[PDB]
Structures are given as structure tokens and as C-alpha cells.
Write a protein that holds these residues in place. Structure first.
Motif, PDB file in Angstrom:
ATOM      1  N   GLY A  54       0.733  -1.002   0.075  1.00 13.95           N
ATOM      2  CA  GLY A  54      -0.121  -0.008   0.036  1.00 13.95           C
ATOM      3  C   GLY A  54       0.918   1.156  -0.135  1.00 13.95           C
ATOM      4  N   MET A  55       0.238   2.423  -0.194  1.00 16.85           N
ATOM      5  CA  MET A  55       0.802   3.938  -0.415  1.00 16.85           C
ATOM      6  C   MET A  55      -0.301   4.940  -0.123  1.00 16.85           C
ATOM      7  SD  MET A  55       3.828   5.171  -0.889  1.00 16.85           S
ATOM      8  CE  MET A  55       4.836   3.862  -1.683  1.00 16.85           C
ATOM      9  N   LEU A  56       0.081   5.748   0.494  1.00 12.50           N
ATOM     10  CA  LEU A  56      -0.485   7.106   0.638  1.00 12.50           C
ATOM     11  C   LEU A  56      -0.161   7.987  -0.570  1.00 12.50           C
ATOM     12  CD1 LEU A  56      -2.841   8.571   2.097  1.00 12.50           C
ATOM     13  CD2 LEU A  56      -0.852   9.626   3.397  1.00 12.50           C
ATOM     14  N   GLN A  57      -1.206   8.546  -1.006  1.00 12.39           N
ATOM     15  CA  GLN A  57      -0.995   9.418  -2.128  1.00 12.39           C
ATOM     16  C   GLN A  57      -0.351  10.825  -1.496  1.00 12.39           C
ATOM     17  OE1 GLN A  57      -4.345  11.427  -4.299  1.00 12.39           O
ATOM     18  NE2 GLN A  57      -3.136  12.406  -5.458  1.00 12.39           N
ATOM     19  N   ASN A  58       0.687  11.132  -2.010  1.00 14.62           N
ATOM     20  CA  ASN A  58       1.624  12.231  -1.556  1.00 14.62           C
ATOM     21  C   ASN A  58       2.100  11.855  -0.084  1.00 14.62           C
ATOM     22  OD1 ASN A  58      -0.463  14.463  -3.483  1.00 14.62           O
ATOM     23  ND2 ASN A  58       1.648  14.199  -3.849  1.00 14.62           N
ATOM     24  N   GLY A  59       2.326  10.562  -0.087  1.00 16.04           N
ATOM     25  CA  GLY A  59       2.597  10.202   1.395  1.00 16.04           C
ATOM     26  C   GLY A  59       3.459   8.765   1.154  1.00 16.04           C
ATOM     27  N   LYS A  60       3.607   8.178   2.440  1.00 10.21           N
ATOM     28  CA  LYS A  60       4.516   6.918   2.607  1.00 10.21           C
ATOM     29  C   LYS A  60       3.688   5.737   2.431  1.00 10.21           C
ATOM     30  CE  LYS A  60       6.302   5.857   6.637  1.00 10.21           C
ATOM     31  NZ  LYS A  60       7.264   5.910   7.720  1.00 10.21           N
ATOM     32  N   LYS A  61       4.368   4.774   2.599  1.00  8.75           N
ATOM     33  CA  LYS A  61       3.457   3.377   2.846  1.00  8.75           C
ATOM     34  C   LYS A  61       2.536   3.260   4.092  1.00  8.75           C
ATOM     35  CE  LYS A  61       5.709  -0.416   2.145  1.00  8.75           C
ATOM     36  NZ  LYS A  61       6.766  -1.560   2.296  1.00  8.75           N
ATOM     37  N   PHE A  62       1.425   2.657   4.054  1.00  8.19           N
ATOM     38  CA  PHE A  62       0.749   2.598   5.164  1.00  8.19           C
ATOM     39  C   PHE A  62       0.671   0.632   5.417  1.00  8.19           C
ATOM     40  CE2 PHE A  62      -3.612   1.181   3.676  1.00  8.19           C
ATOM     41  CZ  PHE A  62      -3.269   1.544   2.246  1.00  8.19           C
TER      42      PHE A  62
ATOM     43  N   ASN B  80     -11.340  11.117   3.569  1.00 10.61           N
ATOM     44  CA  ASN B  80     -10.903  11.714   2.184  1.00 10.61           C
ATOM     45  C   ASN B  80      -9.768  11.316   1.739  1.00 10.61           C
ATOM     46  OD1 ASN B  80     -11.575  12.839  -0.048  1.00 10.61           O
ATOM     47  ND2 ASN B  80     -11.626  15.029   0.758  1.00 10.61           N
ATOM     48  N   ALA B  81      -9.476   9.941   1.704  1.00  8.65           N
ATOM     49  CA  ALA B  81      -8.083   9.470   1.367  1.00  8.65           C
ATOM     50  C   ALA B  81      -8.158   8.813  -0.099  1.00  8.65           C
ATOM     51  CB  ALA B  81      -7.521   8.746   2.393  1.00  8.65           C
ATOM     52  N   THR B  82      -7.347   9.156  -0.768  1.00  7.59           N
ATOM     53  CA  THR B  82      -7.228   8.268  -2.314  1.00  7.59           C
ATOM     54  C   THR B  82      -6.027   7.641  -2.036  1.00  7.59           C
ATOM     55  OG1 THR B  82      -8.311  10.270  -3.176  1.00  7.59           O
ATOM     56  CG2 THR B  82      -7.293   8.741  -4.765  1.00  7.59           C
ATOM     57  N   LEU B  83      -6.245   6.263  -2.060  1.00  2.00           N
ATOM     58  CA  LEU B  83      -5.258   5.156  -1.501  1.00  2.00           C
ATOM     59  C   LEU B  83      -4.658   4.737  -2.814  1.00  2.00           C
ATOM     60  CD1 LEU B  83      -4.982   5.035   1.385  1.00  2.00           C
ATOM     61  CD2 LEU B  83      -7.600   5.351   1.272  1.00  2.00           C
ATOM     62  N   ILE B  84      -3.539   4.396  -2.536  1.00  2.33           N
ATOM     63  CA  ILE B  84      -2.645   3.843  -3.629  1.00  2.33           C
ATOM     64  C   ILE B  84      -1.969   2.598  -3.207  1.00  2.33           C
ATOM     65  CG2 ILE B  84      -0.595   4.406  -5.152  1.00  2.33           C
ATOM     66  CD1 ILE B  84      -3.004   6.257  -5.272  1.00  2.33           C
ATOM     67  N   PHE B  85      -1.873   1.512  -4.217  1.00  2.00           N
ATOM     68  CA  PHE B  85      -1.826   0.170  -3.904  1.00  2.00           C
ATOM     69  C   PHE B  85      -0.656  -0.430  -5.098  1.00  2.00           C
ATOM     70  CE2 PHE B  85      -5.426   0.465  -1.563  1.00  2.00           C
ATOM     71  CZ  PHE B  85      -5.025   0.099  -0.489  1.00  2.00           C
ATOM     72  N   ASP B  86       0.303  -1.118  -4.793  1.00  2.00           N
ATOM     73  CA  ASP B  86       1.194  -1.804  -5.625  1.00  2.00           C
ATOM     74  C   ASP B  86       0.709  -3.305  -5.505  1.00  2.00           C
ATOM     75  OD1 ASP B  86       3.101  -2.968  -7.197  1.00  2.00           O
ATOM     76  OD2 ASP B  86       4.944  -2.799  -5.970  1.00  2.00           O
ATOM     77  N   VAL B  87      -0.048  -3.707  -6.410  1.00  2.00           N
ATOM     78  CA  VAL B  87      -0.964  -5.130  -6.394  1.00  2.00           C
ATOM     79  C   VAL B  87      -0.183  -6.038  -7.475  1.00  2.00           C
ATOM     80  CG1 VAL B  87      -3.104  -5.989  -6.573  1.00  2.00           C
ATOM     81  CG2 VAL B  87      -2.945  -4.070  -5.581  1.00  2.00           C
ATOM     82  N   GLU B  88       0.285  -7.102  -7.176  1.00  2.00           N
ATOM     83  CA  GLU B  88       0.701  -8.223  -7.824  1.00  2.00           C
ATOM     84  C   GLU B  88      -0.005  -9.501  -7.623  1.00  2.00           C
ATOM     85  OE1 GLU B  88       4.936  -9.019  -7.398  1.00  2.00           O
ATOM     86  OE2 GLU B  88       4.743 -10.620  -9.293  1.00  2.00           O
ATOM     87  N   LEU B  89      -0.705 -10.091  -8.556  1.00  3.22           N
ATOM     88  CA  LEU B  89      -1.681 -11.266  -8.287  1.00  3.22           C
ATOM     89  C   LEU B  89      -1.036 -12.324  -8.722  1.00  3.22           C
ATOM     90  CD1 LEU B  89      -4.567 -12.146  -7.367  1.00  3.22           C
ATOM     91  CD2 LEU B  89      -5.280 -11.504  -9.707  1.00  3.22           C
ATOM     92  N   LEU B  90      -0.215 -13.030  -7.817  1.00  6.49           N
ATOM     93  CA  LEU B  90       0.189 -14.475  -7.891  1.00  6.49           C
ATOM     94  C   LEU B  90      -0.431 -15.347  -7.014  1.00  6.49           C
ATOM     95  CD1 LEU B  90       4.179 -13.989  -7.672  1.00  6.49           C
ATOM     96  CD2 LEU B  90       2.741 -14.468  -9.498  1.00  6.49           C
TER      97      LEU B  90
END
Length: 107
Positions: free
Chosen positions: A28-36, A94-104
Motif C-alpha cells: 500500500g501507499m498514501l497519495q503524496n505520502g509514504k506506505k501504510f 477523504n483519502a485516495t489510496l494507492i497500492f502496488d498489487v501483484e496477483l500471484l
């Protein structure tokens, strides 16, 4: 709202279907932010099933839109995860969440 941005390797054919315990290297990732949150940190890539609303709608819809091996990149809106509610201390309202998703996945 689920917009898929796939890093190309994968198979394009093995979709997760209903009740299928599928395996995701999410980061996961926060927009204009670090991981969560990160399944790469815990090193258990989160063997969750489709169709029980365990995960958010920004990630449950993203899983069926992905196939085995695929490495997409989510952009979850406020209203799919935590826009109205917001988590205390972790993910604000009001958070627009960001993700590095890999489906294995499995099943």
C-alpha cells in the motif's frame, strides 16, 4: 472507482472467481505520502477470498480485473476505502489510496 495500471508480466486468463482464496503481494501507499500497509513486509501475501467483502471495494473489484502473475497498480478512491470514515492515526478521511498489487494467486 478502480483504474488498473498493469506492469505487463502475468497470464491474463486466470481470474479470481467467487470464494477463491487468492494471493496478493500488495504494497500500500498514501497519495503524496509514504506506505501504510504491505504484505511484502509481513511476507504472508494475504490469502483472501473473493466475494465476502473482506477487502475494500477498491481492491475486491481490482482483483477480479486482474489475472495470475499480473502486477497492476491500484488507485482507490475515497468512497471505496476510507473517504467518509477514515482510520484514526493511519488513513485519514477523504483519502485516495494507492497500492502496488501483484496477483500471484491460488485457487
Amino acid at each position: 472507482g478502480v483504474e488498473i495500471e498493469t506492469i505487463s508480466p502475468g497470464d491474463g486468463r486466470t481470474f479470481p472467481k467467487k470464494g477463491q482464496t487468492c494471493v496478493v503481494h500488495y504494497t500500500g501507499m498514501l497519495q503524496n505520502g509514504k506506505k501504510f500497509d504491505s504484505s511484502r513486509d509481513r511476507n504472508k501475501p494475504f490469502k483472501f477470498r473473493i466475494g465476502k467483502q473482506e477487502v475494500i471495494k477498491g481492491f475486491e473489484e481490482g482483483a477480479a480485473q486482474m489475472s495470475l502473475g499480473q502486477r497492476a497498480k491500484l488507485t482507490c478512491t475515497p468512497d471505496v476505502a476510507y473517504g467518509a470514515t477514515g482510520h484514526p492515526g493511519v488513513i485519514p478521511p477523504n483519502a485516495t489510496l494507492i497500492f502496488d498489487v501483484e496477483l500471484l494467486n491460488l485457487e
